[PDB]
Amino acid sequence: FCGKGYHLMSFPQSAPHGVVFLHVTYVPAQEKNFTTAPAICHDGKAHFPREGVFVSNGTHWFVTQRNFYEPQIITTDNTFVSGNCDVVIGIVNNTVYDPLQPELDS
Amino acid sequence: STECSNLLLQYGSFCTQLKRALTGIAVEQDKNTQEVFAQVKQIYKTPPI
Amino acid sequence: DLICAQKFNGLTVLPPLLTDEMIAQYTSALLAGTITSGWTFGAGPALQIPFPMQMAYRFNGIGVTQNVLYENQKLIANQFNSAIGKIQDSLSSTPS
Amino acid sequence: TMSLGAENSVAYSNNSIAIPTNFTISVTTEILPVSMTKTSVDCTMYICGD
Numbered sequence: 488f489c490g491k492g493y494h495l496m497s498f499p500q501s502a503p504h505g506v507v508f509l510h511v512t513y514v515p516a517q518e519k520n521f522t523t524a525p526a527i528c529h530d531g532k533a534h535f536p537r538e539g540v541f542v543s544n545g546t547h548w549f550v551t552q553r554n555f556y557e558p559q560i561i562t563t564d565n566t567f568v569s570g571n572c573d574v575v576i577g578i579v580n581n582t583v584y585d586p587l588q589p590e591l592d593s
Numbered sequence: 594s595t596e597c598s599n600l601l602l603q604y605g606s607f608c609t610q611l612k613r614a615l616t617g618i619a620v621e622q623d624k625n626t627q628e629v630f631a632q633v634k635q636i637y638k639t640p641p642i
Numbered sequence: 643d644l645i646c647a648q649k650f651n652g653l654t655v656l657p658p659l660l661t662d663e664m665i666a667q668y669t670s671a672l673l674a675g676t677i678t679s680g681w682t683f684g685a686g687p688a689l690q691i692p693f694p695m696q697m698a699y700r701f702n703g704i705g706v707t708q709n710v711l712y713e714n715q716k717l718i719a720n721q722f723n724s725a726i727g728k729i730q731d732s733l734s735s736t737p738s
Numbered sequence: 739t740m741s742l743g744a745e746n747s748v749a750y751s752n753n754s755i756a757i758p759t760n761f762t763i764s765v766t767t768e769i770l771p772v773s774m775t776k777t778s779v780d781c782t783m784y785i786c787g788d
């Protein structure tokens with residue numbers, strides 16, 4: 488409706504018998520392949536991303552926002568738990584970090 | 594009839610107006626098909642499986 | 643003989659610029675981009691995504707968590723397939 | 739025969755995703771007519787003059 492791409496904002500310009508809209512949009516670029524999974528199996532629990540998606544560059548599993556590659560460590564703060572690992576098709580085994588664990592480990 | 598066309602010439606540019614309006618409608622239909630269906634410039638393919 | 647009677651009096655029908663197979667090829671391209679890439683092909687380059695994960699994104703778009711889909715993936719797929727079959731039956735069985 | 743576009747087979751599989759690593763801020767134009775030329779006709783002067 489407001490240009491090709493994800494619309495950010497727009498500018499009106501007057502024209503003889505008309506209007507010209509300058510649509511400023513966000514276009515994704517320089518995409519990269521990653522191995523993805525629907526959920527992470529950790530301690531018999533299924534973890535799902537709170538706002539992003541699980542990606543893997545080949546060796547390590549991360550969670551990133553969907554429209555821009557920003558890999559982050561899969562923690563309990565950006566994932567939520569629903570059920571065990573027996574139901575989700577395609578769930579992979581990976582560790583999920585707990586920030587309370589180094590505090591109580593020392 | 595040639596003399597009927599000679600009498601039709603005295604009515605002015607009515608036939609030119611009707612032909613121009615119908616040509617506008619005819620190109621408008623193709624434009625409508627372009628706006629509805631030609632929304633991608635890449636012809637994507639389904640994988641074989 | 644209606645078409646010949648129209649043609650003989652100066653009333654001609656111009657063909658459409660796009661044939662039916664080219665419009666069908668446009669719709670096949672739209673289907674392939676939507677199934678293989680989601681909404682990403684409409685906003686830029688087509689980024690591939692698995693269709694259960696795309697449909698989980700769409701559940702997240704309507705305010706339902708992803709685990710509702712991932713725990714019920716077979717049920718959602720069966721309901722979708724039955725609904726498509728019901729579209730084909732309802733279109734074949736209705737004149738209006 | 740006119741070409742519909744370039745063929746682009748999207749590399750679909752059930753465990754692969756494509757994530758963008760960059761972006762382009764794209765500005766495009768959309769031109770929309772708003773008004774016409776406002777015309778008035780004196781019907782008697784057009785048909786008959788004086």
Ligand SMILES: *[C@@H]1O[C@H](CO)[C@@H](O[C@@H]2O[C@H](CO)[C@@H](O)[C@H](O)[C@H]2NC(C)=O)[C@H](O)[C@H]1NC(C)=O
Pocket residue numbers: 544545546547
């Ligand atoms: C995927 O990304 C991770 C993190 O960006 C990489 O892990 C690091 O790789 C470098 C280079 O081998 C090592 O020096 C670091 O010690 C690694 N970090 C950890 C925590 O082990 C990983 O190598 C990447 N994998 C691929 C295939 O690119």
Ligand SMILES: *[C@@H]1O[C@H](CO)[C@@H](O[C@@H]2O[C@H](CO)[C@@H](O)[C@H](O)[C@H]2NC(C)=O)[C@H](O)[C@H]1NC(C)=O
Pocket residue numbers: 528579580
């Ligand atoms: C992820 O880990 C679980 C258990 O931690 C694995 O499930 C086991 O798989 C073996 C091999 O099939 C079975 O003998 C065990 O009985 C399973 N245990 C349970 C509790 O289910 C699972 O295979 C791992 N997934 C991957 C991809 O390695």
Ligand SMILES: *[C@@H]1O[C@H](CO)[C@@H](O[C@@H]2O[C@H](CO)[C@@H](O)[C@H](O)[C@H]2NC(C)=O)[C@H](O)[C@H]1NC(C)=O
Pocket residue numbers: 518519520747748749750756
């Ligand atoms: C992700 O990987 C796939 C292959 O698994 C790449 O798809 C291939 O791309 C090349 C170059 O355009 C084509 O010649 C092949 O025919 C493609 N294969 C298939 C199966 O479609 C894809 O390009 C990769 N994505 C990125 C961003 O590099």
Ligand SMILES: *[C@@H]1O[C@H](CO)[C@@H](O[C@@H]2O[C@H](CO)[C@@H](O)[C@H](O)[C@H]2NC(C)=O)[C@H](O)[C@H]1NC(C)=O
Pocket residue numbers: 517759760761762
């Ligand atoms: C993201 O894209 C921008 C351009 O779209 C990149 O910026 C260019 O970077 C190269 C090399 O550093 C320079 O030669 C160009 O002059 C830059 N262009 C502009 C407009 O700044 C940027 O490097 C890209 N970032 C990543 C991480 O790929």
Ligand SMILES: *[C@@H]1O[C@H](CO)[C@@H](O)[C@H](O)[C@H]1NC(C)=O
Pocket residue numbers: 576577642752753
């Ligand atoms: C993905 O598909 C391949 C072959 O089509 C199959 O071997 C694999 O098990 C599938 N994985 C999932 C999670 O469906």
